[PDB]
Structure formats: C-alpha cells, structure tokens
Amino acid sequence: GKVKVGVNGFGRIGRLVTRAAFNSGKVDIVAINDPFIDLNYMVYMFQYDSTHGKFHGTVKAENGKLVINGNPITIFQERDPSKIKWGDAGAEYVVESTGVFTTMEKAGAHLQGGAKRVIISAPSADAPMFVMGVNHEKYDNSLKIISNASCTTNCLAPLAKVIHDNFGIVEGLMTTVHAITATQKTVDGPSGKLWRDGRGALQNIIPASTGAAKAVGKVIPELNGKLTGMAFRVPTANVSVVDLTCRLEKPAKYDDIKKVVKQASEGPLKGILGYTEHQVVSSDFNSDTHSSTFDAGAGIALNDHFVKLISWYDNEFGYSNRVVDLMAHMASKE
Amino acid sequence: GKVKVGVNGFGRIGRLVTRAAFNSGKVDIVAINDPFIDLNYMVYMFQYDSTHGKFHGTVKAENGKLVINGNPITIFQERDPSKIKWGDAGAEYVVESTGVFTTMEKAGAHLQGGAKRVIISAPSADAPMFVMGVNHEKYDNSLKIISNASCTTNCLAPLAKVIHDNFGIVEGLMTTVHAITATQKTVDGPSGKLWRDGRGALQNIIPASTGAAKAVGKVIPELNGKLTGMAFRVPTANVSVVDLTCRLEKPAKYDDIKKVVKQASEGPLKGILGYTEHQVVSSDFNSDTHSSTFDAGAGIALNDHFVKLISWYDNEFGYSNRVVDLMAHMASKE
Amino acid sequence: KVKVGVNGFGRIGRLVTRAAFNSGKVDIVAINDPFIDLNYMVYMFQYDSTHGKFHGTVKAENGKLVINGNPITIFQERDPSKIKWGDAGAEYVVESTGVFTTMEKAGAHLQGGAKRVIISAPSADAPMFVMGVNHEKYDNSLKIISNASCTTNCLAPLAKVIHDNFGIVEGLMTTVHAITATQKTVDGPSGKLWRDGRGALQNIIPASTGAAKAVGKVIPELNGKLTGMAFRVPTANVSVVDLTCRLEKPAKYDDIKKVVKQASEGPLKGILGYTEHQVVSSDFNSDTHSSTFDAGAGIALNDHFVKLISWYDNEFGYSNRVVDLMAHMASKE
Amino acid sequence: GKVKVGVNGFGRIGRLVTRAAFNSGKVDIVAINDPFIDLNYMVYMFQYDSTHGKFHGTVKAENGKLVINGNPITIFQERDPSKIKWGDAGAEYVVESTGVFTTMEKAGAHLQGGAKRVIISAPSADAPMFVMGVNHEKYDNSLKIISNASCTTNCLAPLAKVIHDNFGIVEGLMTTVHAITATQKTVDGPSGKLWRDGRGALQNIIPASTGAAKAVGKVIPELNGKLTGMAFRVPTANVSVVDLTCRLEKPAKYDDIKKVVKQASEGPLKGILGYTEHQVVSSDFNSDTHSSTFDAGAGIALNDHFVKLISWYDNEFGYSNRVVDLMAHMASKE
C-alpha cells in the first residue's frame, strides 16, 4: 500500500527524511545509498541526533542491512548514481539528497538503476519545483524527476500564497535569520566559493545570498520577479525565521492579515502553515513539522499597504516531512 | 580644562563610556555612582572585559577611590539619584546610564546634586535626542537634559540621512539582528513585562519590539512616521546589524546607492558612517568605533525604488564613543 | 497520592511540577511565587526551551493553574511562614527558591500547615538524601530534609559502587557544568562570586562546589576523602562529572565496567545508567537518570588510579529524584 | 630575526605561525604552500580573523606573491610535499602544519625540495618532541626533523616540570576542557574515525582522547608512564584549560605550590609559564602568548600529597608563538 523509497545520501537531509518516513509511516524506506558512511556508522548517526533526540524505536546492523523497527533496508555504497540497483532493492521513488545531482540530467541517473521517479530534496535549475499546499496539485504522472524546492522556499511560499490571494503582493523583500548548517565551519576555515561562509559559525552573524524568495515566483507564477531577499546565518543549531517586508495592492489592516492567515492554517494548509499569537521563540518550533508558522505578535505594519510578516520554520524537520508528504501525494496519483 | 564627568551606573554602558572617556581623552571622569558594585569589584569589572579585552592602561583601588591611569575617581553608592553629590566631586556633566531614569523628570534628579547637564545614554520619551553626524548641530546651551538615542538609532539614522538626502525615503521597515544584552537570561527565567526576553538567550532567536526606527523620525524630522521596525536577539556576545527595507522616491541603481554612501563615509560622516565592499562578518566589527558601517555586498535591490540596505554596528563600542563625542561637542558650545 | 506544595516557580520548581505531572507518584495542589503571576506561570510551564512544550494542557481558570484538568492553588507570599499550605491541602512542601536552605528557614513552611519540607538544594544542617544511596536512612521523625544537589546525585551513586567494590582511598572531582540561571548573558554584577558574573556565552568559568564533599555526608565512610571544583561552559543543559580516584583494591578498567553495569541493571536501575556508546552531552537531554557512567570516556593510569566519567541531565534527573524522594517518604507514613 | 622559513598549509596553525613570525620579527617567512587556498583568498584569510582580530599591518597580492608588511612571499600550490621547491624560494626551515605529514618519513618529504630542517607543528609518533622552556636545550644540529608537540602538551609540560622538580609527581591524570577546533562539525556530520567528534560542536560537550599527558612523559623522561588523561571539547571559539590531578612524592602545602610556580613564572619560565591569583575566566587569555598560565584560585588540594592544579592556554596564540620561538632557538645554534 505504501510506496517503497530509496534515499541517496545519508547526510542531514537523508537521515531526517528517513526518520520522517518511519515517524509518520506514510512511505516505506527500503534502500539507502552512501559511499562514505558504512553500515555500523549509519546505525549510530541515525540512532542519536543532537537536535531531534534519540530515535524512538530500534536501530541495528544485521546481515549487511540497516534494520529500523524490524524493517531491513538494503545499503549501497556507490559513488556513481547510475550504478545504484534501486529496482533490485524494490525502491520505486528515490530521494536525491546529496545536493550535487540537482539538475534533471544528473538526478535522472537513478532511473538507469530502476527507480520510477526521483524527488530532489533541494532547489533545481530545471526540474519542476513543488511546495506542498501551494502547487502540489500541479504535479502529474508524466513528471518523473521533480524538486521539493528548499526549506526557506517552503516557509515563504505558503505565507506569500495567502497574502497574495487576499491582498495582492505588489513587491516584497525577504530576510531569513537562519540556523547554522553543515556547509559552515566551526572556526575560520576555507570556503573558496563563498568567503563569508568559511568564517567561524559560533562567533559570527554571517550574511549570505539565497534564491529562496526568487524561487517563490516559480512556484507561484503570478509572483515571478516580485520577490527577492537574503539571509543571515546565526549561531543556533536549528530553527530559522523568515521576515517578509511587502507592499500590498489592497489595503490590509494587521487584524485582517491575522484573520486570513488563521483561517488558511485551519483549512487547505492545515499542518503546512501554522498560526500563533503566543509569545514564542525559536526553540518552541524544535521538531515542529509545519513548513511555516505565522507569528502574529512579532510582525509590524507601517500602514495598510506596507507590512513586515514573520514566520518560523524548523529548517530540518518541516522540510524532511514535506519530502515524505510529496511522495505520499505522488503515490496517490499513480 | 576638559569637562569633568560623573557616570551614574557601572553596568555595561557606564563601564564602556568610562573606557571610551579615558581612551579618547576628550573628557575627564571624576565621579561614578553605583549602589550595588563596591570599589574593589569596580576595579575587576573595569580591568577585565570578555568582549573588548583587558583595559590598555592601569586601574586600582586606593584610599576609597577608583584610580584609572593615575586619575582618582570619587565613588558614590546612592540608590536615589537626587542624593548623589556630583558638585562635591566636581562633576559638571552626568551620564545617566542605568536605563531607569530616562524621562527629563527622572534624569533631572542629577541637577539637585549639582550637575550642570545630564546626558541620558538611552532613548527618552521626552528629552531632545541626538545622533552625532545627523543632528548634533541642533544642540544648544539651553538644553540641560538630552539623550544620545540608542545604539540601533545611531546605526540607522546616519544611513537613513544619506539615503533620504539623495533619493528620498517614501517609507521603510527595519529589522535589527541584535547581539545578546544584559537584560536577557542565560536559561528560561522571569521577565514579567516582556515574556519572550525571559527565554534562554543561548538557545533562541527571540523577536523583540524596538522604537529605534520610529526614533529616527525624531532625529530626522522629515522621516517622522515613515519608518518602523522590530528586532531579533540572537546568541552572539556583541556586534549587531540593521536591515533597512525601503521604498525610494527617485530611482536609485544599487551602484548609485554605493557611490553616495561611500562619498558620505569619506567626507561629512567620516568616523560615524563606514563603508565596505569586503566579505565581512560580525566579528570584523569587534571594538569598531563607527556608529554604522554600510555592507555593500550584503544588500540587495528588487528594483530602482525598492531596496534592502545592510549596516553593521558594534552596539557597545560605537555607542559608548558617541556618548563621549556628544559631551565633547556640548562642552565646546559652553 | 501525597499532596504537595511547591515554593518557587523558578527552574527547579517548574521542572519538579513537570515531573510530578508525568506520573501519579505525587499530586501538586499548591504553588507559591510572589514574583510570577498566574497567566505568566501558564506560559513558563507550557513552553520550555530545553525540554520542549509540555505534552498536556495548561490554562488559567478561576484563579487556579490547571494542568491536565487538575487545578492548583496559587499563592503570592514573600514570607514562607505566611503561606497557607494547610488550607490548600499540601502535606509536603518542596522548598525550591534556594534562599531557605537551613532547617530554621525551611521550617517556616510547617507554620502554614505543612507536615514535611523537602529542600531541593544542599543544606548546611538538614539530613541530606540521594535516592539509591541512603534514602533507606529516611525516618518519620525527619520533618525537614534535603535532596542534596544535582551534582551530588550524579557522583554519589557512582562513588557508592566504586567504594563498595574497590574502596576509594581519596578522590578529586571536576564537573563540566551547563550554564545556570545564576549566570549572566554578558559581563555583569555577581558581588559574592566575581567569576560567575562574566559572560556565560563567551567563557569557560571555574567555580567552587561542595558537591564532592557532600558525598562524604551521604556515604559517611567517604567523609573527608573527596573534594572538587567545577567549570561552567556555554551549553544550555546536561553536565558531566569527572572523578579521579585512588582505589584500595586493584581494579582493572574492565572490572570497574562490570560492577557499574551490574549495579545499573539491578539495584540502581533507573538511577545509575551505563553506556559503552559514543555518546555526547545532547544524548542525555531529558534523560531521567541521576548518573550515567560513560565506559568509553574514562581512562585508567594503573589498577589503583583512574578517571571515571558520568553524565547527568542537571535539570531532569534531579527534578525526578525530588518526586521519587517524596513518593518514598509517603510510602513510610 | 634572520632564518628564512617556509610554511606548509595555510590552515589556522599555518596562518597564526605566519602572524606570530611577522608580529615578533624573530624569523622571516619567505614561502607558503597550500594547494586549496589561492593567493587572493590567502590575503583575505590572513587579514581578517574572528578570534584574534584584523592583522596589524598590511597584506596584499602583488605579482603572484603574498606581500605582508612589504615582504614578498612565494606561494606554492602543491599537493605532494616532496615537489615544493623550498630551496629555490630560499626557505631554510619548513613548518609542516597540515596535520597529515607528522611522521619523520612523511615530514622528510620537504628535504627533497631543498629545506634544511622541518618543524612539525603537531605531535609526531617518532620525531624528537620539544616544549620551549622544558627540553629545548636538548635540541642539537643533527636533528633535521623535529616536532613542537601539541598546544595541550605545551600547557601541561611547563607546569608538570615545576611540580615534579619541587615535589615529584608519583602519578597524574589530566582533563583538558578544550575550545572547538577545525576538525569539529557545526551540526551532526561524518567523522568516520572518531564518531563523537562528528557531533554538533555548538550543541555538545564532547569527550575525546588525547595523547597530550602521555607526551609529557617523552618531553620530561622522568615522567614516562606516570601521566595520562582525556579531553572534553566545549562550545567556545578559543582558549582551553588543563586540570591536572596528581599525587606528590614530597608533601606540598597549596601555598608552597603557589610560591614555586610564581617563582618559575618570574624567572626561567618567564613568557612561557604565567601565574595569576586574579578571578580570571577563559576570555581573559584571548591572544595571550603564554604556553600555560597557572590559576592559583581555581585549584584545590585534598591533602599535602593529592592536588588538582589548573592552567589556562590560548590554544592558538601560545602554540603558534612557541613554533616561532623554537625556530629562532634552532637558528641561533646553526
């Protein structure tokens, strides 16, 4: 009944998509490929997690397989994705989570080994991009290689959809205050392509470029060219926040914005877009599976046409659960 | 001789204004009041600083006085500011740095003990407010009680002045990503008036309200009612950044904004407004005495009339040096 | 079963309340805190940066704090002798403010109708207990007792097993401790303990602690044989003890592992844990053990001189031991 | 200040040895090899430092050379250390700072390119190991490949020397509470050989093995087999502390220990072993060039034969200055 899934890469996204699949029970993980992490080490990395705690259940290495809650998973150690025998392991969909095979040409290598569909758990320069709750109904059975966009695009797009649908976004500029990530360094070190990103992550607020706001214009075509932004990386291990400053076409009193976001969080976007009026801080969203949670108290309006809206996101758990939800949606359309 | 100064409070601002006074030599500190920090403890707190390093000169306790670089300072321990005998110590100007006597009525208590003028090192609901380089020439000898605004207003106002003078700010919304402060808590604790501020400072990104952007409209009267904003407190010990999203009246290409800001930093705002095109991060501004440093590479434009401008500020050292600069300017007008 | 009142809604008071609402060992019926009003108590109990959102419901209703539908009377008294514990029905009181730790000061709660007081901190003169080590020495004549500190509850179960099997001739302890509420975010005033005022995020801070000396009161045979100190480091929770000790009988490191594992699997089950996994501090977040021996982290110089490592969630282990001590006291009435 | 030096690796040790060489003027850096960091990036990494601040001087790229304070430095980009043309660049001594060529066989590759002597800025399994102030007089001109031990061994050995010389160490066990390092990860990531070291550095206290205490037994042969220990990595960017628990041969009152350590710090170990009775914390040692600073107030004695001694070390700046001091000592004996 559940679609069988293969995961390429056991980095942060790969492990948390695997954890979301077992926690939610929406899909069945049957294979994992990682050429640099051996089976005994995969048991340790999956079982203990500094951010989300110990896995609830059992994890062990048995007969060359990773056995999670009694379910044996085939382990591959291939550097070339076209050589992974996904079909022999029974993996129908493959989550491409390494971050280095994000074009349709590179991600398509998984079809050579027998996968039926590939979900890139990152932005893609050319694959169709989806955000659950915003454009997932535009998915169709002819699309064999798709992208789930980024964690930041999944936070901004549901909020931008509600605001644009009700008031019309003339233009917007976004800032994301983002938790540290695996690409950063503990102390000042080499990052040849992005010099600021090499600076010590524990000591600094680091400005960074991000295509997340521009990507919202691809998922919501009416907002193409109307949004852009940037990021600041700060020394917190997890949970990030979006700050969208936008100009509205129709007048919107701040209480009217709260009303429409609250009603959207209770209907078609339930579990995707959250809403709170509580005095929350980032740790209150630790392991929260929403893509975006509107913080009513934190935002501020200058006038009825110019406002700053705040939305929280667990950049690890929200996104990993959306990858699983996208695959469950795809399976329902077969 | 140089103006003789009394400092009320030996907290973070009081100690760093004392440090800036002795390092710049622009004024002479002759008295310090603090009811909770005794003399031997003041020596220790002034000598060692986790953020700015050990004091460059000498500091010791001798015959009941705090002696800095051979200069003896009378120490008072009064809870009620109207009882501090400033005149008996020779203090002419008093820096009111406790944060709890910020109205002209409360700060005016220092005139009862013999002070001639009082400088509130914080925003005031009613005192005239100044930002060096923006409106300090509006100071006159009839003003006995004034405010130096906040560190954040001193960062935003010089940048907003240059942008408004050249292109005209129709409206703007600001976010400041701010380093932790003394009012925050190490672990979740009580903060009855501001619940989010009680949450653990090391673990969280904390939204906070700030009147800094609205205060720029008092310092630059043409911007009254055209700016507002909010803050996020993040776990860094020092150095903060302003993110101003504004709508411009005249078209401004991003290279034209860079040209205008660079010219201001090299001329009338030299030492107040800095400019950089380097790949900087927050630690690069540790102990930097500018009020604001425009980060050309970090900002982003959506179009010629809607842009996001970034400016760094050492929230401790920039502001403490501006308090001394303001007092030196006031003394020159006597 | 026993009805309890909590004095103070700081970190220990809230987490003792949270632990009490994880089982039915005790029932919280009253809370006193003159500085935190009812609506703020709802917020502070509901959201916790370290241990996550409370799993149940929490709301203010008719002037009472209602947790999982169970109402609690709220008092706002600065003087402990004035709290009306008896009128609320509180038989035992957890004295968690940290400022009424002598038997004279903690005894003020008996004036309001409480039968027994449990000081959730070390006391200069009250009998001190550590569950699993000397709780069987508790007697119905003791109306005011102390549950020692989180650090003493980590060291004492391990020191008991080591001393029982090999004999501790002498020991020196270091605890690498997570930040606490008494610390400061940036360099600020701490008149009595100057190093503790220095910015907690920026520094490793040495600190004095009577925890190792207190083990000698809990285990009388170790009186005068242990002392130590602490380093506060910038982590929000979870701490570790490092006990360097000289043993009377020779003990190979595998023999130490065997006796600690045996104690964890039987008589000290749920109090002293044992692991051979490649653990780090976050692996003990919200772990309710008092002490978890880290077999891989320790090191022996020889059969008589070793360094033993044990982890403790300084918030959750201790708060659960306060509740366990009260359940034990109730079984003895 | 006359031996010409080549530096292999421009990681944190390589950059800080280069900074110490120009700050002290004791040696002349003439060449640097790093195959992954190009010239323009070396300028940036050397100029800005999150921990120690901006370089005091000038640094530019000119005609393919890195020019520091007007001194041109030849830049090599060789992966194979036997192919670096040290002799052609005039480099007489080579600092091997990559951490991957620490045996005499591997470090000996620099002799193929014309270097006369090699100093491994890390522990070596077989090279002679030195600690300035403890055994540097045992260096002789027949030793072409030597090691300067580790930052932790340089902290413990000067203190252990004074304690052993005066009271005799029967046995000792050390714990070092260590700042984070470049080998750690920002979030839980792969560290196949040392699993605990892959866990998120910002979130955890991490136990780690270290041969530093055992290495003191090689630098002070009388202590061979009498010391061992372990480490805890904690989330601070720099500055570490040693905690030595030792049993003494002769009785020693804690005041006698303070007296002999203070005397050593004022005489033969001046600049190597420091001494303080102040209420210090780790940030008070930021950029401190001592190898070890005894903290009199932090330690504790159980009795006259069993004590815990505490000593601070700036793990970056102390050690980098000792590498330069060792090379200036070797140059003086040529």
CSV table of N, CA and C in Angstrom, one decimal, chain B residues 44 47-51 53-54 276 278-281 283-284 286, chain D residues 44 47-51 53-54 276 278-281 283-284 286:
chain,number,residue,atom,x,y,z
B,44,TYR,N,37.9,45.2,39.2
B,44,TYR,CA,37.9,44.0,38.5
B,44,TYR,C,37.0,44.1,37.2
B,47,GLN,N,38.8,46.3,34.6
B,47,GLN,CA,40.1,45.8,34.2
B,47,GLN,C,39.9,44.6,33.2
B,48,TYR,N,39.0,43.7,33.4
B,48,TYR,CA,38.8,42.6,32.5
B,48,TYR,C,37.5,42.7,31.8
B,49,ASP,N,37.5,42.5,30.5
B,49,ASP,CA,36.2,42.6,29.7
B,49,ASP,C,36.2,41.4,28.7
B,50,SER,N,35.2,40.6,28.8
B,50,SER,CA,35.2,39.4,27.9
B,50,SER,C,35.1,39.8,26.4
B,51,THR,N,34.4,40.9,26.1
B,51,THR,CA,34.3,41.3,24.8
B,51,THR,C,35.4,42.2,24.2
B,53,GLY,N,38.5,42.9,25.8
B,53,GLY,CA,39.8,42.6,26.3
B,53,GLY,C,40.2,43.5,27.5
B,54,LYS,N,41.3,43.2,28.1
B,54,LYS,CA,41.8,43.9,29.2
B,54,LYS,C,42.0,45.3,29.0
B,276,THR,N,32.1,49.5,3.3
B,276,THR,CA,32.9,48.4,2.9
B,276,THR,C,32.3,47.6,1.8
B,278,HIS,N,34.2,44.6,1.3
B,278,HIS,CA,34.8,43.4,1.7
B,278,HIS,C,33.8,42.3,2.2
B,279,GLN,N,34.2,41.1,2.2
B,279,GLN,CA,33.4,39.9,2.6
B,279,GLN,C,33.4,39.8,4.1
B,280,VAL,N,32.8,40.8,4.8
B,280,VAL,CA,32.8,40.9,6.2
B,280,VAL,C,31.8,40.1,6.9
B,281,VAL,N,32.0,39.8,8.2
B,281,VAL,CA,31.1,39.1,9.1
B,281,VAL,C,31.1,39.9,10.4
B,283,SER,N,32.2,39.6,13.5
B,283,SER,CA,33.4,39.7,14.3
B,283,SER,C,34.4,40.8,13.7
B,284,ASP,N,34.3,41.1,12.4
B,284,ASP,CA,35.2,42.1,11.8
B,284,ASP,C,34.9,43.5,12.4
B,286,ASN,N,34.3,43.9,15.8
B,286,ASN,CA,34.5,43.9,17.2
B,286,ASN,C,35.4,45.1,17.6
D,44,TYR,N,42.7,37.5,2.2
D,44,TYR,CA,41.5,37.7,3.0
D,44,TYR,C,41.6,36.9,4.3
D,47,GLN,N,44.2,38.6,6.6
D,47,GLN,CA,43.8,39.9,7.1
D,47,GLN,C,42.7,39.9,8.1
D,48,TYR,N,41.7,39.1,8.0
D,48,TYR,CA,40.6,39.1,8.9
D,48,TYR,C,40.6,37.8,9.7
D,49,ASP,N,40.4,37.9,11.1
D,49,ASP,CA,40.4,36.8,11.9
D,49,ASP,C,39.3,36.9,13.0
D,50,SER,N,38.4,36.0,13.0
D,50,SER,CA,37.3,36.2,14.0
D,50,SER,C,37.7,36.2,15.4
D,51,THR,N,38.8,35.4,15.7
D,51,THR,CA,39.3,35.2,17.1
D,51,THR,C,40.3,36.3,17.5
D,53,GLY,N,41.2,39.2,15.7
D,53,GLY,CA,41.1,40.5,15.1
D,53,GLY,C,41.8,40.7,13.8
D,54,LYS,N,41.6,41.8,13.2
D,54,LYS,CA,42.3,42.2,11.9
D,54,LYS,C,43.8,42.3,12.1
D,276,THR,N,48.7,33.6,38.0
D,276,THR,CA,47.7,34.6,38.4
D,276,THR,C,47.0,34.2,39.6
D,278,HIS,N,44.2,36.4,40.2
D,278,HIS,CA,43.0,37.1,39.8
D,278,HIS,C,41.8,36.1,39.5
D,279,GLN,N,40.6,36.7,39.6
D,279,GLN,CA,39.4,35.9,39.3
D,279,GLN,C,39.1,35.8,37.8
D,280,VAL,N,40.1,35.2,37.1
D,280,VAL,CA,40.0,35.1,35.7
D,280,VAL,C,39.0,34.0,35.1
D,281,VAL,N,38.6,34.3,33.9
D,281,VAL,CA,37.8,33.3,33.1
D,281,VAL,C,38.5,33.2,31.7
D,283,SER,N,38.1,34.1,28.5
D,283,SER,CA,38.3,35.2,27.6
D,283,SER,C,39.5,36.1,28.1
D,284,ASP,N,39.8,36.1,29.4
D,284,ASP,CA,41.0,36.9,29.9
D,284,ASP,C,42.3,36.4,29.2
D,286,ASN,N,42.4,35.5,25.8
D,286,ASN,CA,42.3,35.7,24.4
D,286,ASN,C,43.6,36.4,23.9
